[PDB]
């Protein structure tokens, strides 16, 4: 059985008949050790991509890198469901999302880069009662702007010139 992966101890067991094991969609999942008869599960080692979080060259040049779905042990490091974040410091404070990282974690520039759980808003328990009403005594008259595309550039290419000229 040829391949690469992390060969961990497994609780699930094959039959004494069966020697190999596949996962759903026909991928190797566990194999019984031929030397000593026990079944070791396989989990291929991490290959998640790496991304860069930046506030912009206008503000600073500091960089925070996210290695997706990789433990920080497998190269300040902050472990997140999205992945391992390096260069950003976790904070217990909550702020509105600035640079979305994922799984509720967002980063921002505050000197350095700080990562946190996004605050969904200000928790406001309405003073509800079965004989209490709130009536406005004024108004605002608010003018907002709503931008909507209606068309694009009317491009037109000719295949002959593009392909042959």
């Amino acid at each position: 059985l040829t391949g690469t992966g992390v060969l961990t101890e497994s609780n699930k067991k094959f039959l004494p008949f069966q020697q190999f094991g596949r996962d759903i969609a026909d991928t190797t999942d566990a194999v019984r050790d031929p030397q000593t008869l026990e079944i070791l599960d396989i989990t291929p080692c991490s290959f998640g991509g790496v991304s860069v979080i930046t506030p912009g060259t206008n503000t600073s040049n500091q960089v925070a890198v996210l290695y997706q779905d990789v433990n920080c042990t497998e190269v300040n490091v902050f472990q997140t469901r999205a992945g391992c974040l390096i260069g950003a410091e976790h904070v217990n404070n909550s702020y509105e999302c600035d640079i979305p990282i994922g799984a509720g974690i967002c980063a921002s520039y505050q000197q350095s880069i700080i990562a946190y759980t996004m605050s969904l808003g200000a928790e406001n328990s309405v003073a509800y009662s079965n004989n209490s009403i709130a009536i406005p005594t004024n108004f605002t008259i608010s003018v907002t702007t709503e931008i909507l595309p209606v068309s694009m550039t009317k491009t037109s290419v000719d295949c002959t010139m593009y392909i042959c000229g």
Binding site: T137, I141, S142, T145, I147, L148, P149, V150, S151
Partner: protein
């Protein structure tokens, strides 16, 4: 960045076009990316294979470009239908659809042109200076339950008023702004007060 959406569309076009032209400098496994050089070095029987190599890649790139252009045109057409609906409803009339014509009780919208789109200036009514009052579903007077004709039964702690639901204008409780249905034994939150009749003093 306020017009970023529009900018996005422009970028999504321009970048695509650039990508297309950048596909003209790709060998695709051919000896070069210039047809004239290939025809000027190789014999046409053997240059045919290289021309095929170029043509296959360029045609695939062109088909991909047209496919993504069609998808972008579909999304832009959806946006244009949305804009036409908003011009028909927000601008040409007053819309009762919530948060369609901006946030708040929409009053009226003003259209403005933009290089490849429209900008709606939504003037909407947002009421904000709140006051709490003690409230009644109904008012008991001579066992009639006196429900409010058009407003809400608010109270200053002590006295009661029939105000409109979006601006505190108290007004006294009279038979003209109040209508009667049944007696005071069915309504859960009935509150006992006096409703004023104008006609009797008018005598």
């Amino acid at each position: 960045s306020a017009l970023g959406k529009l900018q996005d569309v422009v970028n999504q076009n321009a970048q695509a076009l650039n990508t297309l032209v950048k596909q003209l400098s790709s060998n695709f496994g051919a000896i070069s990316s210039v047809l004239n050089d290939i025809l000027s070095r190789l014999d046409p029987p053997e240059a045919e294979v290289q021309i095929d190599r170029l043509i296959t890649g360029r045609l695939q790139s062109l088909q991909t470009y047209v496919t993504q252009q069609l998808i972008r045109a579909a999304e832009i057409r959806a946006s244009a239908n949305l804009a036409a609906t908003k011009m028909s409803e927000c601008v040409l009339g007053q819309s009762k659809r919530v948060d369609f014509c901006g946030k708040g009780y929409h009053l009226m919208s003003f259209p403005q042109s933009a290089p490849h789109g429209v900008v709606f200036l939504h003037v909407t009514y947002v009421p904000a200076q709140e006051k709490n009052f003690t409230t009644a579903p109904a008012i008991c007077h001579d066992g009639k339950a006196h429900f409010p004709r058009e407003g809400v039964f608010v109270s200053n702690g002590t006295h009661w008023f029939v105000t409109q639901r979006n601006f505190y204008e108290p007004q006294i409780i009279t038979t003209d702004n109040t209508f009667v249905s049944g007696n005071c034994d069915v309504v859960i939150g009935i509150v006992n007060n006096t409703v004023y009749d104008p006609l009797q003093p008018e005598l």
